[PDB]
Symmetry: C2
Subunit: 242 residues, 2 copies
Amino acid sequence: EWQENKSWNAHFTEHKSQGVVVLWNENKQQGFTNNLKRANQAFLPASTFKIPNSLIALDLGVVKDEHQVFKWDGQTRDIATWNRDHNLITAMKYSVVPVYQEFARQIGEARMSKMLHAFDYGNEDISGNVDSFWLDGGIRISATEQISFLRKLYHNKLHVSERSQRIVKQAMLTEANGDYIIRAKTGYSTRIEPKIGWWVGWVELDDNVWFFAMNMDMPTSDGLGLRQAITKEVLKQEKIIP
Amino acid sequence: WQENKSWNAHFTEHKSQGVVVLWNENKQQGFTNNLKRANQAFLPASTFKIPNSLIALDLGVVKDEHQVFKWDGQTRDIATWNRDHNLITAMKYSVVPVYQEFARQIGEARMSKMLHAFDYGNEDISGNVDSFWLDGGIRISATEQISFLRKLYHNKLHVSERSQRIVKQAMLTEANGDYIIRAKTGYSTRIEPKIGWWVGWVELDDNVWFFAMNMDMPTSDGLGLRQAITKEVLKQEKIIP
């Protein structure tokens, strides 16, 4: 069950933003959102797709491990951090699209589609073709669907090996300290309206895990840090993090 | 294997005595303030939770990082111990009693073989099966810790890849956009000299810096210096901001 807490809207309002945050309390098997409607609206996953894309690439052997280097092709792209060599960890961290497009090509459309279906991932539509569908094709996923997917990953219940899932959860590591561990993935969908930012993942506490998936309208790149800030503004309000 | 005696200031500043050892994985170069003490072997104390975890996982004594180890209802000096734990929280709170139970279940034969297979320190588990890393015969130097950690990082220890991955998960101490630290503290109080340890590594985008430090720890008061000193050293070396 899901509970709407419209008070979280203040965190969007304060930052002159519109969006949804969805939380799931694993112990209590309860979910919370500021906007049930938008929680169930599907959007392009953009770089959040790196999570399933990694799982599949690892499981098929397209990526041997998290150390394998994927050389910069020497083509300066807009994003400075992309113009360097990468492995899975840093490719995830810096959302290095070109690396994952190459994975997607090597995976191919048949295996990609089968695996997404096996994952129950979003609308499971990769039209098309292989190497951009999460950016400007047909694949869409809602925040509540992201939670469902993430929960399976956390529990190693996705239809790939345990190793693949552990490696991807490693690669998702975003922040940790004595109070919490956040494993998550950002996304930024720009190719198709509405432009949105994502942050999906979970917060590991000593005794519980809180899954989250947020997206928000992102008319310009200026607002990208709000993905995390608003999520954390909500996590703080809910005493999940200090 | 450079000695940089300038890092001694980081110990002197805190009226402390100790050693920090760094290993730059890419350059295959090590650095320390004190080559002698870098090679001096001490009780590992709770840094032993790293190999103890690996062995427990690999033998099935620990099924996974979620398995709960119920508190035995004995209230001890450390509050966080007086509660149920899994591998992650047991490592985080250095829950000795949990790992003593693992050690008992592992037993002396398998413990000894495994430490040899790990090339771990002096590989000597003389003493109580469930306390030898606290007050038995096992000794390991900072440089030996680095050697062991390097094998762990590369999944080259003689246990399954899964075991090594889980323990590296459990070692997670700190992460942000600049670095990840996977590490384990220790505090050897039973047998003189009382020392504190911090051993692990810092993962950067491009490189991994292994570290192992220990320092005299006459009282618990100084325990935060383990991390503080290591981090000022890391900061001086521009490894972390």
